[PDB]
Short mmCIF file of C-alpha atoms and ligand atoms in Angstrom, two decimals:
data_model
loop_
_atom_site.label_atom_id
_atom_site.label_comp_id
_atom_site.label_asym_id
_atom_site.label_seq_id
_atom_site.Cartn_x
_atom_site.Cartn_y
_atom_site.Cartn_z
CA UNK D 1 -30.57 -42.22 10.71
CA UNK D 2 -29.08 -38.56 9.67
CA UNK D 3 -30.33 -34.96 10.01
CA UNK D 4 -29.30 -32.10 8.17
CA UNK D 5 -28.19 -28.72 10.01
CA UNK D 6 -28.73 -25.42 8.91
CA UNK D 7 -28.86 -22.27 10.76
CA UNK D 8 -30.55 -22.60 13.52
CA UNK D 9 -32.60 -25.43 12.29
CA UNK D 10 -32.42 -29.34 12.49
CA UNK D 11 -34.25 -31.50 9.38
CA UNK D 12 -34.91 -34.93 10.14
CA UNK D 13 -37.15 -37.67 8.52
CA UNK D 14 -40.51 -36.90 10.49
CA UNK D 15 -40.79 -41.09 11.66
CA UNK D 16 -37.59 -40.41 13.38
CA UNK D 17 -38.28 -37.20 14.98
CA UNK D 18 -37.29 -37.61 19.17
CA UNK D 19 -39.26 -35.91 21.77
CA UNK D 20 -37.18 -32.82 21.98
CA UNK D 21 -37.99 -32.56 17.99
CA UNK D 22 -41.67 -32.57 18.78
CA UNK D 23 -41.36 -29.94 21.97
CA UNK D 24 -39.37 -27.45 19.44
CA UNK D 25 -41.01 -28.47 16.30
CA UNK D 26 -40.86 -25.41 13.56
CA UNK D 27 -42.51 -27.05 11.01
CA UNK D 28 -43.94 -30.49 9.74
CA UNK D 29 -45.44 -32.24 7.04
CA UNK D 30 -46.53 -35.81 7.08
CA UNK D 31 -47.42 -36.31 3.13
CA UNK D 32 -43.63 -35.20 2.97
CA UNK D 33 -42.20 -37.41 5.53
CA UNK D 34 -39.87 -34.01 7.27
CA UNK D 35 -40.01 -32.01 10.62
CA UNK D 36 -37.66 -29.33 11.61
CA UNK D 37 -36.49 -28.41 14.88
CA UNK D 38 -34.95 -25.50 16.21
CA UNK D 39 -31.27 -25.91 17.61
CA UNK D 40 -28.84 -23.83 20.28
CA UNK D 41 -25.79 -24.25 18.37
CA UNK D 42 -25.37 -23.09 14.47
CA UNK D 43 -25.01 -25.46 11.95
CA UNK D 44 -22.87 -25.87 9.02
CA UNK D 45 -24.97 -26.98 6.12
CA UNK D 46 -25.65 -25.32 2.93
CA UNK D 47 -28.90 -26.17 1.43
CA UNK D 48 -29.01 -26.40 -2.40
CA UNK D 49 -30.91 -23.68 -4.22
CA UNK D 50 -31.00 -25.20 -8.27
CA UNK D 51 -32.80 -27.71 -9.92
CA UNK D 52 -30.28 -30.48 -10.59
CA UNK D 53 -30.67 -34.02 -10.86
CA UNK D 54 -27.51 -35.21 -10.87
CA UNK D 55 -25.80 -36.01 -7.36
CA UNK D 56 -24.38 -38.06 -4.51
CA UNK D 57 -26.03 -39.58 -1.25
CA UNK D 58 -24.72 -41.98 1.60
CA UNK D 59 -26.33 -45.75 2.18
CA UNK D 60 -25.68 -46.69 6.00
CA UNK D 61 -26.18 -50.37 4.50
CA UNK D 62 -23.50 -50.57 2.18
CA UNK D 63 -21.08 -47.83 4.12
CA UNK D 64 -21.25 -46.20 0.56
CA UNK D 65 -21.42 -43.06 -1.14
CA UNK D 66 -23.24 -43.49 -4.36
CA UNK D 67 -23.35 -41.21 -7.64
CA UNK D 68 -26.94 -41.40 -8.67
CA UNK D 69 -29.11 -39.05 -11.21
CA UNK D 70 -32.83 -38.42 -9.42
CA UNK D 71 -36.31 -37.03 -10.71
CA UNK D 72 -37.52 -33.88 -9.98
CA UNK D 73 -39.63 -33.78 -7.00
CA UNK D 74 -43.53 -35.09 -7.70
CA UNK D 75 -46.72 -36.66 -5.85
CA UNK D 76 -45.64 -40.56 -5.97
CA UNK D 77 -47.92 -43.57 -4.26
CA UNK D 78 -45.59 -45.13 -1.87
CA UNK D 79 -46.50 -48.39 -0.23
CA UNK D 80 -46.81 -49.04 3.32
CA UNK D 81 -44.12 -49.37 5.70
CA UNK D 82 -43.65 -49.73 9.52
CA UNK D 83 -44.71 -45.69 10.03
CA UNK D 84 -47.24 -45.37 7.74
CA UNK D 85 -49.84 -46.65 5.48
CA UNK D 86 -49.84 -46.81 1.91
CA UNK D 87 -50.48 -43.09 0.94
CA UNK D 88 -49.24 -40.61 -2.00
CA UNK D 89 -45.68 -39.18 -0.95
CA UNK D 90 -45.12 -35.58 -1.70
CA UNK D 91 -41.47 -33.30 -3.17
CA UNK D 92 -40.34 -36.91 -3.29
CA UNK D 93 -37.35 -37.88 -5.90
CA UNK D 94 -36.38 -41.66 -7.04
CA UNK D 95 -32.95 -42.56 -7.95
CA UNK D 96 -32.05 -46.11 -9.34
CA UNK D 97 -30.14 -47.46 -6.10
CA UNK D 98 -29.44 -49.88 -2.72
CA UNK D 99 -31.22 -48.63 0.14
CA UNK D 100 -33.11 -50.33 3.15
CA UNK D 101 -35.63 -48.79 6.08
CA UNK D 102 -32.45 -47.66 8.10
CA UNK D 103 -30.50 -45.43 5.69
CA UNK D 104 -33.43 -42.77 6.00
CA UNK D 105 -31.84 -39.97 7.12
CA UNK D 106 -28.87 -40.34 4.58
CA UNK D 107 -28.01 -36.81 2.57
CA UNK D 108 -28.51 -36.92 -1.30
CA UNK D 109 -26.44 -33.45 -2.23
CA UNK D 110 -25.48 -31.69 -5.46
CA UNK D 111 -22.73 -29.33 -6.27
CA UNK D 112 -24.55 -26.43 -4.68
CA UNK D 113 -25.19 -27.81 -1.30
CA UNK D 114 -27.94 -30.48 0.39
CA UNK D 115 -31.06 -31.65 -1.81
CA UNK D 116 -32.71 -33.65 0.64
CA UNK D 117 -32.74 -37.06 2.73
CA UNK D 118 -33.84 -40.50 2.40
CA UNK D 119 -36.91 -41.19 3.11
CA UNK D 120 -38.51 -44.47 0.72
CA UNK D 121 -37.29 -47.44 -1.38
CA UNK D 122 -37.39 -50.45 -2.41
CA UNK D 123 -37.67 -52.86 -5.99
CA UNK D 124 -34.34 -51.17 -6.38
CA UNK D 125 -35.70 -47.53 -6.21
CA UNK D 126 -34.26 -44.87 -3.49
CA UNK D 127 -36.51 -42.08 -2.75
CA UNK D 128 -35.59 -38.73 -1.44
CA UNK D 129 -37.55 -35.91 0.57
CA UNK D 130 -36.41 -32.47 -1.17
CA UNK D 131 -35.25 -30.05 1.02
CA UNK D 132 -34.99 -26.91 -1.71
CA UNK D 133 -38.04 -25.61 -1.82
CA UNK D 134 -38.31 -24.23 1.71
CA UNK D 135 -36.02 -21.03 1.44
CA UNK D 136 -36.80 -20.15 4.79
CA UNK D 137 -34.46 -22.81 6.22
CA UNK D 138 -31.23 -20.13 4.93
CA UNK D 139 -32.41 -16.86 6.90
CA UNK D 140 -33.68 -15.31 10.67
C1 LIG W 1 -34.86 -46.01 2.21
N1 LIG W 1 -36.05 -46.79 2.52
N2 LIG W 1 -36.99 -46.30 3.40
C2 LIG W 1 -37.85 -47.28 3.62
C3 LIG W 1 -38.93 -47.10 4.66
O1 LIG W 1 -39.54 -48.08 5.10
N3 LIG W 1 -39.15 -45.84 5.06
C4 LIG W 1 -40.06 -45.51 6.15
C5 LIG W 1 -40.71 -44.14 5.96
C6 LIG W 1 -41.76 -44.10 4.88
C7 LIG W 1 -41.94 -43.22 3.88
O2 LIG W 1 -43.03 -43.60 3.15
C8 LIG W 1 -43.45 -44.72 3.77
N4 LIG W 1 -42.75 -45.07 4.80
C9 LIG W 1 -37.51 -48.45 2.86
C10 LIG W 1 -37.95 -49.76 2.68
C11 LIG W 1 -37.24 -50.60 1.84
C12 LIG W 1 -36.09 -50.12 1.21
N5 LIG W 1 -35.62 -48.87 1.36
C13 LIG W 1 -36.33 -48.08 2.18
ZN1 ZN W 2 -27.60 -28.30 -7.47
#
């Protein structure tokens, strides 16, 4: 589990999304595995604006914080899980690292703020949904 605040705006891996998500949903994508929500209460996360690939995220399953270096964010087939079927991931990044279904959510971030979340894995491979692209998330 693990969302990302920003704003006015809550990011969480779209399989987890509650009710309350879905009743104030701003925006989703299933090929990218995200849905924000709107929020009362301002949030204190800075979302990265670069292209690094360099950075650190948080496994749940090991209680760890791991440096890792990540690929840019492509169209990668991901196989099927509990939440969906085998299908082509999108703005997804792979790092060589531990992860299992329930550190989704986890924050991969760079010097210059939040990157994305965890979203895939397995064989060894952690996959993260980037985050950097949508500029919106920093203004109104
Ligand atoms: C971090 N991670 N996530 C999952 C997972 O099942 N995600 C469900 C969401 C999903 C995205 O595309 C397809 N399913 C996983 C499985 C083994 C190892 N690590 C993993
Ligand atoms: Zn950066």
């Amino acid at each position: 589990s693990g969302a990302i605040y920003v704003g006015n705006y809550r990011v969480v891996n779209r399989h987890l999304a509650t009710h309350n998500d879905w009743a104030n949903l701003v925006w989703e994508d299933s090929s990218r595995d995200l849905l924000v929500s709107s929020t009362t209460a301002q949030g204190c996360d800075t979302i990265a604006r670069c292209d690094c690939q360099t950075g650190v995220y948080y496994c749940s399953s090991r209680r760890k914080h791991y440096p890792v270096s990540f690929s840019k964010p492509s169209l990668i087939f991901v196989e099927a899980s509990e939440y969906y079927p085998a299908r082509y991931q999108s703005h997804l990044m792979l790092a060589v690292g531990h992860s299992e279904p329930g550190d989704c959510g986890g924050i991969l971030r760079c010097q210059h703020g939040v990157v994305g979340i965890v979203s895939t894995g397995g064989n060894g491979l952690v996959g993260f949904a980037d985050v950097r692209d949508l500029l919106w998330l920093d203004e109104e």
